[PDB]
Amino acid sequence: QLHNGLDFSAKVIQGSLDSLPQEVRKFVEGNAQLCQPEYIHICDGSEEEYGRLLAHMQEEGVIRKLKKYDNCWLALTDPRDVARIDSKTVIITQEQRDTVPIPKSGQSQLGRWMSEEDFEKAFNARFPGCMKGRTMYVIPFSMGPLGSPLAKIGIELTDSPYVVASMRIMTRMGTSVLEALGDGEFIKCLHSVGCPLPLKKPLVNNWACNPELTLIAHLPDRREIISFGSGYGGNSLLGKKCFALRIASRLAKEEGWLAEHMLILGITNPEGKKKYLAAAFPSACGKTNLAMMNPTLPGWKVECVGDDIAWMKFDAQGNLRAINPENGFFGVAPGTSVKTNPNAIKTIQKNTIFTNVAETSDGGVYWEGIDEPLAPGVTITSWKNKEWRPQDEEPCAHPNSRFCTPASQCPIIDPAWESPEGVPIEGIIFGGRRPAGVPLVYEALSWQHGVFVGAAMRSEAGKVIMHDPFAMRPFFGYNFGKYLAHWLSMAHRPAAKLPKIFHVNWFRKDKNGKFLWPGFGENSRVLEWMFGRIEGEDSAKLTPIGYVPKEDALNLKGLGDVNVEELFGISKEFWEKEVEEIDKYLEDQVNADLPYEIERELRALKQRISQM
Numbered sequence: 001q002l003h004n005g006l007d008f009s010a011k012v013i014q015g016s017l018d019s020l021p022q023e024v025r026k027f028v029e030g031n032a033q034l035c036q037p038e039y040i041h042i043c044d045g046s047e048e049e050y051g052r053l054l055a056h057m058q059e060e061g062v063i064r065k066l067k068k069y070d071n072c073w074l075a076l077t078d079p080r081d082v083a084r085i086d087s088k089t090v091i092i093t094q095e096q097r098d099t100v101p102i103p104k105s106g107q108s109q110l111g112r113w114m115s116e117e118d119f120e121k122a123f124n125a126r127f128p129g130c131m132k133g134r135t136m137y138v139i140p141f142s143m144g145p146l147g148s149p150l151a152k153i154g155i156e157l158t159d160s161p162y163v164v165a166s167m168r169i170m171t172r173m174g175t176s177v178l179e180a181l182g183d184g185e186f187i188k189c190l191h192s193v194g195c196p197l198p199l200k201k202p203l204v205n206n207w208a209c210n211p212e213l214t215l216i217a218h219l220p221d222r223r224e225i226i227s228f229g230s231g232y233g234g235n236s237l238l239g240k241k242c243f244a245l246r247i248a249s250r251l252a253k254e255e256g257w258l259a260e261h262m263l264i265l266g267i268t269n270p271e272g273k274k275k276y277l278a279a280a281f282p283s284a285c286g287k288t289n290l291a292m293m294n295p296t297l298p299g300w301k302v303e304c305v306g307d308d309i310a311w312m313k314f315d316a317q318g319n320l321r322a323i324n325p326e327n328g329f330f331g332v333a334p335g336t337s338v339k340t341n342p343n344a345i346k347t348i349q350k351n352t353i354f355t356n357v358a359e360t361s362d363g364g365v366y367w368e369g370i371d372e373p374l375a376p377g378v379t380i381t382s383w384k385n386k387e388w389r390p391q392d393e394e395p396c397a398h399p400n401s402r403f404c405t406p407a408s409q410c411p412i413i414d415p416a417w418e419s420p421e422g423v424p425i426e427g428i429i430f431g432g433r434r435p436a437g438v439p440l441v442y443e444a445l446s447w448q449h450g451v452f453v454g455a456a457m458r459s460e461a462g463k464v465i466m467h468d469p470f471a472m473r474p475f476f477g478y479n480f481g482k483y484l485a486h487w488l489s490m491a492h493r494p495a496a497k498l499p500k501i502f503h504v505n506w507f508r509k510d511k512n513g514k515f516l517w518p519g520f521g522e523n524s525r526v527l528e529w530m531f532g533r534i535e536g537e538d539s540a541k542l543t544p545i546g547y548v549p550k551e552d553a554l555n556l557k558g559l560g561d562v563n564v565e566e567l568f569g570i571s572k573e574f575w576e577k578e579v580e581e582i583d584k585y586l587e588d589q590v591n592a593d594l595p596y597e598i599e600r601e602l603r604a605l606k607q608r609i610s611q612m
């Protein structure tokens, strides 16, 4: 330097720029030059750092301590910033077609491309000076066990202490990650709440955000994620959806693996045999309930590897090995109860951050569907920081409110959940909310059929049934047609042991709007059937849509009131409509990039339905 504006050492309040690997230093200092933070804090991941940052947020009114529990905390947000926001989420590539298929007639629902030129303008209108008066925290983090051949490293720069705290839970972060990285590659993650000091606009609820300029961008060819204006969830905790789905799905395509919106569980039967399964359901369709299931069937055990994201790669032996790249659960709070998710209830009463839930007067948490009475006298403060009564029209918790809890605390966390080699997946499950037409469970006829089943996924949002292929509609890092081809190519991998593919529906309803299946821990009975089918058991009957359980194949003991005929009913009329809708969707949305085999599976299903 000819002056003193490029070396930021004097502003470092933890760590040392000299200690960092050369490329990490360049990333930090270049963005410090741009965003103009007051200080730079290089995170070490220590309990001391974590304790002190929580206390600082507490001092500032940014979080409250939940005194009923052990080291639990509550953040209430600006109501403008409450959710991952797909409408302001983009992927930048040279050519649009690499990001989304060019649709035949419509607008793509499979992604949102932005040109390099448009992104440069958007970036320049946002980031220069955006951290003025704030600390830039440098978060070194591993997605996956440290040392796993399947793990990847990120560096997230943020001006949000809430993001630091939450990333310590949801990733493996701190000094050991810098040491593991050395001069290797890493995903560059840049985040700002977009509220430089002095504040140009009012701060609502002590929650810094800039909704008008919110933009969550992914630049896969530059290995960069750049996020501005939201402090919330998937928009700010950049390891989770940004990295471990959007960027990682593209990396996966390049490198021969898969990055999916799937839980991973281990299930052990009464004969002491264990298998791992993965399942892809959309948001609001119960991955976290399944991943942590307390099975009702005697002698069965479920253990949780992860509840949301799976990274999977065939090894040299042909086994599909999966890791959970996360380090915690970022679970939807409302609807979580002792009956719907008793293992979550156990997990979240220590070392857990809650966002947008209600607070009880004794310092506890509350939400819709907690299904748990309060003692007379105990009152509730809503997520909008107002007194709230059970008879009020508004909910006490935001519908997308979340807990953020360490995975190591889960009482059924799988003993191999941090195994660097991953766990061998033997079945993959698809599913969504279908109130009509779709049976409780069916099994695909082939790998190709099963990829089609993933592709054809639909789920209830006046009710609207929308498409959500592979539970990845918000999350494809690249052209969905090419993603299909990538999944199909797995069948041609020498020695591959391709898992059995199933589709489930927990949500079928009778004519009165009542669920036909009780669900939750009773889903263990469906898992039992899958288990047997993986073992080769003669428990399946062929239908037009795939294999279903034979009469009397499901254990229905302790239920008895279940209407199996309606629950497993397959209507020609319904399935004719269904195939037409899938046809129209794939034709428009995937168009010139629809693989031959998926078109063939569509034709085959239409043909089988035609013979009913």
Ligand SMILES: Nc1nc2c(ncn2[C@@H]2O[C@H](COP(=O)(O)OP(=O)(O)OP(=O)(O)O)[C@@H](O)[C@H]2O)c(=O)[nH]1
Residues within 6 Å of the ligand: 281, 282, 283, 284, 285, 286, 287, 288, 289, 290, 307, 308, 330, 331, 332, 335, 340, 506, 507, 515, 518, 519, 520, 523
């Ligand atoms: N009827 C029924 N509902 C279920 C079952 N399992 C989960 N649910 C419902 O699914 C919702 C909870 O699922 P979420 O935690 O939002 O789903 P998720 O897949 O983990 O979502 P993300 O965390 O956003 O990826 C609640 O409405 C539950 O009542 C089931 O077996 N039967």
Ligand SMILES: O=C(O)C(=O)CS(=O)(=O)O
Residues within 6 Å of the ligand: 083, 084, 232, 233, 234, 235, 240, 241, 282, 283, 308, 330
């Ligand atoms: O939306 C999902 O599927 C999530 O798991 C929440 S967030 O991480 O996108 O905020």
Ligand SMILES: [Mn+2]
Residues within 6 Å of the ligand: 287, 288, 307, 308, 330, 331, 332
């Ligand atoms: Mn979940």
Ligand SMILES: [Mn+2]
Residues within 6 Å of the ligand: 261, 283, 308
């Ligand atoms: Mn999710």
Ligand SMILES: [Mn+2]
Residues within 6 Å of the ligand: 488, 491, 492, 597
């Ligand atoms: Mn093929």
Ligand code: NA
Residues within 6 Å of the ligand: 061, 062, 063, 075, 076, 077, 078, 205, 206, 207
């Ligand atoms: Na707040």
